[PDB]
Amino acid sequence: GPHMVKHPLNTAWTLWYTKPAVDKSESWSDLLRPVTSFQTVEEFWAIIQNIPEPHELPLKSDYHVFRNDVRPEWEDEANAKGGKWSFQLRGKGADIDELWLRTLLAVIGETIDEDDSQINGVVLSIRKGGNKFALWTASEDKEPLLRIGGKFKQVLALTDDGHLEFFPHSSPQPSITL
């Protein structure tokens, strides 16, 4: 059929997956790969509707969505001087699918990033102790981090009692709590 008129995103993005280990001999590098890259709203939706939703994912897996020129590794030059805003869902009662989707929309939509971009990507981690959302920033500039963190809190729909913690990648206590 015909091509839809696409709506561009401000940068390209790549979805990565960390698989859970099936054998004692698999390393991190063996378990992480980039899956697909996209730069339109429509391509994003087609990907999201054809990969497993978060509630399907196994323990010790991760989704990463990062700008196409940044690896989801803190060693990457774009990440190494920065950190992440982290949120842990103590409980399975939250709708992790919708929280993740809202986070993704906010990220690719450039709504909560600074105009001078700080956000490099976002990570969903499936973990026994509770699942985590992490929003990765290029720097530790405090004032821009506070604005991103507050907006991230609103995207995730937390009340004052729910807490975001910012962790500089160079480690493990948080330097900001919201």
Partner: protein
């Protein structure tokens, strides 16, 4: 559809494309519409995704 879903910064200096969450929702494939299904770029992109076994969902 809480307030944040309509939020988006205005008058961005260093970016061109910004979307509120509701604007992105509005572009999601709609019920009973083949616009996405018939788009050959979309079709090819979906075909390029991994097979189901890749995700190791069986590991629980």
């Amino acid at each position: 559809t809480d307030p944040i879903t309509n939020y988006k910064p205005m008058d961005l200096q260093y970016k061109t494309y910004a979307y509120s969450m509701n604007e992105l929702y509005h572009l999601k494939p709609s019920l009973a519409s083949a616009s996405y299904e018939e788009d050959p770029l979309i079709s090819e992109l979906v075909r390029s995704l991994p097979k189901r076994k890749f995700w190791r969902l069986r590991m629980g």
